[PDB]
Amino acid sequence: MKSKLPKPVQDLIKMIFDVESMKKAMVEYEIDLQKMPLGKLSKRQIQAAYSILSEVQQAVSQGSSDSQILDLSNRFYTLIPHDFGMKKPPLLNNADSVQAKAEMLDNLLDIEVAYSLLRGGSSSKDPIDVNYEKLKTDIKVVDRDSEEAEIIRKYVKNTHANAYDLEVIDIFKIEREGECQRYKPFKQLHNRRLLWHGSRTTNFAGILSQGLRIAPPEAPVTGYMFGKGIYFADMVSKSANYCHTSQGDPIGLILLGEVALGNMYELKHASHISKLPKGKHSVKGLGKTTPDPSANISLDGVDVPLGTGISSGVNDTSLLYNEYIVYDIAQVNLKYLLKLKFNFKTAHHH
Numbered sequence: 234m235k236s237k238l239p240k241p242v243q244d245l246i247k248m249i250f251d252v253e254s255m256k257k258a259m260v261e262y263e264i265d266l267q268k269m270p271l272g273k274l275s276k277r278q279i280q281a282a283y284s285i286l287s288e289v290q291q292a293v294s295q296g297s298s299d300s301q302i303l304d305l306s307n308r309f310y311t312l313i314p315h316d317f318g319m320k321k322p323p324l325l326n327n328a329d330s331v332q333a334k335a336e337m338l339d340n341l342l343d344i345e346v347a348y349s350l351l352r353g354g355s356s357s358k359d360p361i362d363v364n365y366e367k368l369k370t371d372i373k374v375v376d377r378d379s380e381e382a383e384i385i386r387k388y389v390k391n392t393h394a395n396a397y398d399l400e401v402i403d404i405f406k407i408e409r410e411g412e413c414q415r416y417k418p419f420k421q422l423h424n425r426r427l428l429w430h431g432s433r434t435t436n437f438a439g440i441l442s443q444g445l446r447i448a449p450p451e452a453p454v455t456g457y458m459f460g461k462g463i464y465f466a467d468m469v470s471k472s473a474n475y476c477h478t479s480q481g482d483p484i485g486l487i488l489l490g491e492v493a494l495g496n497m498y499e500l501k502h503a504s505h506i507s508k509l510p511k512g513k514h515s516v517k518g519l520g521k522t523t524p525d526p527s528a529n530i531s532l533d534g535v536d537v538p539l540g541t542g543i544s545s546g547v548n549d550t551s552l553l554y555n556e557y558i559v560y561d562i563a564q565v566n567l568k569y570l571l572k573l574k575f576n577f578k579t580a581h582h583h
């Protein structure tokens with residue numbers, strides 16, 4: 234039986250469950266696919282590797298010796314086998330190294346979730362329908378001529394301004410099973426905004442299945458600029474840089490989420506939050522650029538900051554764009570999924 238899902242929904246299913254994309258992501262990370270094939274990735278393995286990174290982070294902090302640190306570095310590579318060819322395995326002895334390996338584990342985790350989902354279960358059904366249902370998400374195509382489509386394109390167009398233009402191909406209205414009920418206690422909080430979240434295409438089967446998640450306790454808290462939360466932006470330029478597109482594959486996926494921010498703890502610099510101050514429900518990283526606040530609109534009771542980029546007054550800040558971080562997964566209600574085309578082209582700075 235052939236699926237009766239619209240072709241954009243079917244094409245999305247194939248895109249996010251694509252096994253060759255999962256293998257390609259691991260090769261770019263230089264993981265040894267012979268010692269550690271796709272099907273041997275596990276949650277405990279990845280958690281064990283995070284803990285080693287936390288131990289490395291504390292070895293630098295406590296002035297550990299070279300032998301101490303090298304043995305930890307080798308434990309990581311025994312757990313997650315890499316193939317560096319001629320090259321020596323990089324030593325995990327600095328905050329930069331552990332931050333790169335932390336980000337790789339973040340992405341390897343969503344690949345494990347996707348591949349497990351794809352191989353779990355059972356026929357007579359179209360496999361595209363079978364795998365749609367595994368996502369436990371209602372996925373609808375938004376009409377290109379609707380007003381919500383026009384607002385979403387305006388949000389993309391206004392908040393983008395580095396060597397590429399963005400083209401919205403498809404807009405999906407999404408509803409993760411159970412997420413609305415989980416979000417309800419926070420629908421009452423004030424300061425709810427519609428924000429961007431970009432990620433690699435290999436993460437979206439996990440994102441739809443399990444929602445946006447917080448890094449686990451084993452992960453190094455110094456791996457995350459503002460601590461272990463869920464990160465959003467108010468400008469598509471910031472989020473789109475996480476889509477991991479290229480000349481060979483110029484199509485990415487990006488989310489629009491309703492985020493209940495409440496009272497924002499405003500920071501200009503990194504802070505490894507493990508608990509918010511009393512009275513604060515979120516963090517706002519202040520950027521030098523902000524969408525023009527006189528152009529805000531309200532789409533279904535949620536503020537949508539689609540103003541064109543203007544300068545904020547903020548000085549001595551390390552961020553070009555605003556960032557919003559919440560530390561409770563229930564503060565997020567995913568609303569739209571966009572398939573974006575990256576049209577790469579240079580243009581000099583005026």
Ligand SMILES: C[C@@H](NC(=O)CCc1nc(=O)c2ccccc2[nH]1)c1ccc(-n2ccnc2)cc1
Nearest residue numbers: 339429430431446447448457464465466472475
């Ligand atoms: C640090 C944080 N990094 C990201 O979420 C990367 C994508 C991203 N997209 C944006 O649009 C964005 C907009 C603005 C700022 C940052 C932004 N980062 C994080 C959160 C959770 C985990 N984690 C690990 C295991 N389980 C969950 C990993 C990383």
